Amino acid sequence: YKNVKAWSGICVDGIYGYVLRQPNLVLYSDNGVFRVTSRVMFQPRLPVLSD
Amino acid sequence: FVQIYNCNVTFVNISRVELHTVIPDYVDVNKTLQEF
Amino acid sequence: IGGMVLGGLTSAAAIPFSLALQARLNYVALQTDVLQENQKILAASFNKAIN
Numbered sequence: 001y002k003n004v005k006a007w008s009g010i011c012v013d014g015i016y017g018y019v020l021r022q023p024n025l026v027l028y029s030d031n032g033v034f035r036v037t038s039r040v041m042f043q044p045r046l047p048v049l050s051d
Numbered sequence: 052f053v054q055i056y057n058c059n060v061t062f063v064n065i066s067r068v069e070l071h072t073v074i075p076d077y078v079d080v081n082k083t084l085q086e087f
Numbered sequence: 088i089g090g091m092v093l094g095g096l097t098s099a100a101a102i103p104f105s106l107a108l109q110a111r112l113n114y115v116a117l118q119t120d121v122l123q124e125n126q127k128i129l130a131a132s133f134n135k136a137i138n
């Protein structure tokens with residue numbers, strides 16, 4: 001398994017937290033590139049607003 | 052939908068512009084900004 | 088056993104067992120990779136396990 005730099009969410013302008021709708025997903029920093037993965041299997045993809 | 056690169060052959064073959072006829076309310080904002 | 092390959096197609100058309108398994112993987116975690124790197128590994132591993 002990989003070591004993943006997870007974030008609890010994004011807080012835009014210091015006011016608006018946004019978090020992934022689905023609890024089974026991890027938002028993480030791939031050396032500055034934000035990506036989303038399953039908590040079970042490392043199958044990463046880019047985030048969309050609809051997440 | 053979710054975005055995944057790759058295009059593993061057996062996919063609807065379509066341009067970004069034509070996409071709005073497959074997914075209603077899709078907006079190509081970049082093209083739009085170039086026109087407006 | 089035939090139910091493993093008689094995937095949900097018209098007629099009584101079957102699918103490759105490789106596909107059947109891919110579906111059973113997506114069930115667990117939606118797969119984001121077009122190419123099945125995992126299948127040759129798992130087929131080989133499976134074959135050893137059965138032997």
Ligand SMILES: *[C@@H]1O[C@H](CO)[C@@H](O[C@@H]2O[C@H](CO)[C@@H](O[C@@H]3O[C@H](CO)[C@@H](O)[C@H](O)[C@@H]3O)[C@H](O)[C@H]2NC(C)=O)[C@H](O)[C@H]1NC(C)=O
Binds near residue numbers: 060061063
């Ligand atoms: C959607 O458009 C793509 C891109 O034009 C088409 O996929 C490509 O189709 C050709 C025909 O299906 C593939 O066959 C190739 O033929 C040459 C002989 O002319 C041969 O040397 C190559 O080995 C090969 O088999 C090509 O690989 C393939 N594209 C992909 C991604 O594999 C695809 O046909 C169109 N999609 C659909 C659903 O038809």
Ligand SMILES: *[C@@H]1O[C@H](CO)[C@@H](O)[C@H](O)[C@H]1NC(C)=O
Binds near residue numbers: 080081084
């Ligand atoms: C899309 O618009 C942004 C805003 O005008 C501009 O930075 C970007 O380069 C445009 N992208 C494309 C692909 O034309």
